[PDB]
Amino acid sequence: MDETVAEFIKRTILKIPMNELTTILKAWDFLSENQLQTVNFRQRKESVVQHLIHLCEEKRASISDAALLDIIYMQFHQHQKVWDVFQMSKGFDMKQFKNSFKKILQRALKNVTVSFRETEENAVWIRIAWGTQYTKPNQYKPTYVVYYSQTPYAFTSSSMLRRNTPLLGQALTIASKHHQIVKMDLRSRYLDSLKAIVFKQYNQT
Amino acid sequence: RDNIQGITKPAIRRLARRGGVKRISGLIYEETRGVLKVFLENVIRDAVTYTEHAKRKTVTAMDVVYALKRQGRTLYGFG
Amino acid sequence: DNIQGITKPAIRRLARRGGVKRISGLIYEETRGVLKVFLENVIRDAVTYTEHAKRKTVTAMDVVYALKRQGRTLYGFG
Amino acid sequence: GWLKEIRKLQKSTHLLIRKLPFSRLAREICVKFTRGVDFNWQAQALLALQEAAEAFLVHLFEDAYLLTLHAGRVTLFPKDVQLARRIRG
Amino acid sequence: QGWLKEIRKLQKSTHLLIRKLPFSRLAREICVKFTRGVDFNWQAQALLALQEAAEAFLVHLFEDAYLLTLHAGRVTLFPKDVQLARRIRGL
Amino acid sequence: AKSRSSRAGLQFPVGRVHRLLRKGNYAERVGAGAPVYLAAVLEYLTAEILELAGNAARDNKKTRIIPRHLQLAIRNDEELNKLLGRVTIAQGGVLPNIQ
Amino acid sequence: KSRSSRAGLQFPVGRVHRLLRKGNYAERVGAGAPVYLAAVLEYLTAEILELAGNAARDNKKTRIIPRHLQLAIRNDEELNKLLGRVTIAQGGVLPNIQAV
Amino acid sequence: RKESYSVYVYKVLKQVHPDTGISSKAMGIMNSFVNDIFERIAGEASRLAHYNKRSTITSREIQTAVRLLLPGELAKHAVSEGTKAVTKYTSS
Amino acid sequence: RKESYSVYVYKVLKQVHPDTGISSKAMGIMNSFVNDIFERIAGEASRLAHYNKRSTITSREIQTAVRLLLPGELAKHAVSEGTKAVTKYTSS
DNA sequence: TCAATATCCACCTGCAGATACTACCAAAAGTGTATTTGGAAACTGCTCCATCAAAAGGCATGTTCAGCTGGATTCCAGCTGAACATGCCTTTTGATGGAGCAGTTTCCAAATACACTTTTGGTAGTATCTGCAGGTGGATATTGA
DNA sequence: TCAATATCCACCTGCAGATACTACCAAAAGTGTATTTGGAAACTGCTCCATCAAAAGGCATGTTCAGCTGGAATCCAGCTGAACATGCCTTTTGATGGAGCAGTTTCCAAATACACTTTTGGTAGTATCTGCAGGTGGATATTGA
């Protein structure tokens, strides 16, 4: 594979504690369980990741697979990031939402990378890597979004890279069955705490 | 823009004048850019090795100083 | 003398090995001077290495270490 | 006059290339060796690199203008920069 | 001609070009000015090492310096060429 | 019983390299895999140079390598010359070059 | 009762000893090496500072800056030889123009 | 009392050029070659461990020193060879 | 946690030029100067002891290294100063 | 263009120095095994200092001109190379002693460890004070005449 | 040479950003006292190789001449610098992260010591064989014709 995705996957895997590497790998499912059994998880981390990277090289891994891995990683390590809330008002199936969001971003910006993954409670996790009309995207400064289709609420992570927030909000508002969006008075590092109060307000207005 | 056309004619003229040069041919502005690019490539390659060895994502001044000292160039005012 | 034993033909041969077609008559003194300068710098470093050890014979390794100091690593003798 | 500018620029010590262009170029070069990763750069590292580069270029220009005059000229040619690098090693 | 035959012959070879006794004599004369006036002995391989190094130095300098005659539009080697080569090298 | 050069698959000595690293005041401790790596590197470089030199010898129609051949090899190669640019080979001569 | 005082020095003898011990220069270090080296370092330091202060005085100033160090070094035949492969930050160049 | 690398040079030579000998002057040059590269690599490896406050020299230090010293493709192949050597040393 | 040579440079300065100060950028240059010469001298002294099969660095090694590194009259005066320092250190 | 003379190039012969091979050996150096120990990896976490945007004004960009310089040509006298005849200095060879190198003693100097005192680095909060920027007045060289 | 204009120096005032000076502290580190150990100096002896002589001839030295080249003087056209009007990119500032750096734990890999093989360096002695020099012998360009 390209030398730029090998480094991405290696750096991503070196961040994962040995106490839970196997669980993440199993969820990713890119490597078969037989290949996992082939590996030794007791020698130092560098050799383990060398072996896993060789396995990925035998197959053909694309930036989509690595993006899926990064999404899965953040599902477990939510607290690493600060999470902000957005609200949508004045208002499609999941596939239409996916296509509209992706096409909006691709029209505004020539070079991007988008990915989705489903989750319980009708949730969808989104990862966006921002680019420009001249330059490639940055895979190490992404933007993560958690949107619950049966609700007008959307939660966002604080990137060290602005200049794309209004476009993101517009894409969320258009791809879904809404036409406006605002920011709520809630922000913290604990996504579940925001979630609980937000749906408490949603169910009990 | 190509990020090396940001090294302008006046800057090159100023470096030449500080070197004592009275007149300059119009073909000196592209030659100098290549020289500078080669120098920077050589220094930066070694600087990045020193910091990736240490398992960092941040280039410090000591890495640059070590690289230069390797290349045969010793710089004092930094630490 | 002892610098005039570096002869005109020897200098001319050294020049020809370097690809020189013609040679002014004032090159024979200039070459002698620069050679005499080169030997002084090496020989004193050799003698210093030789005196730190308490012996009165200059060995090839002293010369090699001296040249290595000057930046002129030599292969063949040690 | 060239004579006033030379005298002024030899009394001075400040840097002559602007900062942001140099920073952009040095970051563009770095990303090729890091395999796509955008490394961070301390502020005191770019100044070091700039000082070194400007010194290198000034001394090279001196050595080359020594070779313009050897040839009976006043004007600096690339012909003269190339030969100085060959002789320096 | 005669210069081209000699150049071709000499670049094809490896042997030393300065005679041995004169070089020995000069090196010993230089050594005696250090050492506080006493005469050191010399191994033979030492003098051969020094001679090889010296001839290499001189041949390479003549090479670097005949590049400055052609720069100046000449064919004949002058001393200013050697001086400037030494200056630019840093010696 | 068994050596370490054989485990590594080498001709160069892994014990001697270890000894020289320990006796050279390079650091307080020396790992197990450093001598293996270094011996392998040295073997690779030797083989490269000897290959080029044997080729040069054959071109000149000779069966035996001499310093002339090593000099030709080194100066005809764009990388070995950069590694060995401050080095003079005894009894090696110069490359033929006119003009 | 300090070692620098016994020797008549301002530079630190104990620190030099510690740095020689920790640098993997040899398995042992004697007692006169640190004092000898500290004295050499002090001599060179003062030799540079004198010339730098003189250059500052010539420029009508009471505070030394890297320009003065550069002038000192490059106008002295021996210090330039010692420090000829060195570039000094914020030092500039010596004025030099030449006729053709 | 005196020791050298001649045995192993001769083996490598008989391994790349089986028909070809080597003179005594040349093997001195090769022995000098081997001693020089050893010193360079080990010197760089000594500093990297000092810069980073380490008391042990490992294969990683040697690898980094190889990358710094050797130019281009030559470093690439040297790294490959050393990595293979360590790999099959450990697996025995 | 960080250490330097600034105290002693300031003392020496007040000892040669009592009326004269020094800026912070310049003392960095001087600290870099002191660290460089130390490394050179100690490096040469390390080799001389290795060449001659010695396990100890003494004042003689430093003296020889000083002679090798420093040019001309500067080495002469440095040798004088170091010799005096050792002489009056021993006599206490 | 012709071609003898160098000159080149190839090819064969002989032999002398230097290589490669075999045997002995012995020592010193590397390997295996078991124990203990300390350095470094793995995981947390917190504060610093790096990165990203924005607003504007100062330096760079573009066009024209004319004066200066680079480059080619001609001519002539100085200086280099080539050839030839001498002979003086280098090269090669061999008896000789001075200095390097190994082995044995011992003794002086360095490492190890514990207690105790001193010094240096960093922060808080000052207080100067040196040097730079702007303003103004006096004095000369060079531009063109 | 006259001369106005920059330009050159010099002096002055103002101020603010940076250097010296105190306090203080407390952590790290250096010093002093005993004790043990081993590295290097001092002495003797031995044999290797480096200095010092004396013949032989091959390369260096000196003179002269012919021709090649360096250097100076013309001349012409290309091209670089200077000046002016304009606008775009760099500099400065403020706001957040995210990555470096310090802390704790533990476990795995390194040092240490002892007993046992093995490999490499050196020495006779063997022989053999590669390449250098010589000479034959075929065949090409070359500067004088």
Author numbering:
A (entry chain K): 1 to 91, 99 to 212
B (entry chain B): 23 to 101
C (entry chain F): 24 to 101
D (entry chain A): 46 to 134
E (entry chain E): 45 to 135
F (entry chain C): 14 to 112
G (entry chain G): 15 to 114
H (entry chain D), I (entry chain H): 33 to 124
Provide the publication's sentences verbatim.
The histone variant CENP-A is the epigenetic determinant for the centromere, where it is interspersed with canonical H3 to form a specialized chromatin structure that nucleates the kinetochore. As one of two pillars for kinetochore assembly at the centromere, CENP-N recognizes the CENP-A nucleosome through its amino-terminal region, while forming a heterodimer with CENP-L through its carboxy-terminal region to recruit other CCAN proteins. Here we demonstrate that the human CENP-A-interacting protein CENP-N promotes the stacking of CENP-A-containing mononucleosomes and nucleosomal arrays through a previously undefined interaction between the α6 helix of CENP-N with the DNA of a neighboring nucleosome. Overall, our data suggest that CENP-N, as one of the key proteins of the inner kinetochore, stabilizes, organizes, and compacts centromeric chromatin in a way that depends on its specific interaction with CENP-A nucleosomes and on its DNA-directed interactions with a neighboring nucleosome.
Previously, we reported the cryogenic electron microscopy (cryo-EM) structure of a CENP-A nucleosome reconstituted with the 601 nucleosome-positioning DNA sequence in complex with the nucleosome-binding domain of CENP-N (CENP-N1–289). In this structure, CENP-N makes extensive contacts with DNA through the pyrin domain and the CNL-HD (CENP-N-CENP-L homology domain) and specifically recognizes the CENP-A histone through the α1 helix and β3–β4 loop of CENP-N16. However, α-satellite DNA is more typical of the DNA sequence at the centromere, and we therefore determined the cryo-EM structure of the CENP-A nucleosome, reconstituted onto palindromic α-satellite DNA1 and bound to CENP-N1–289, to a resolution of 2.7 Å. This DNA fragment was chosen because of its first use in the structure determination of the nucleosome, where it was shown to exhibit precise positioning around the histone octamer. CENP-N specifically binds to the CENP-A nucleosome through recognizing the RG loop on CENP-A by its α1 helix and β3–β4 loop.
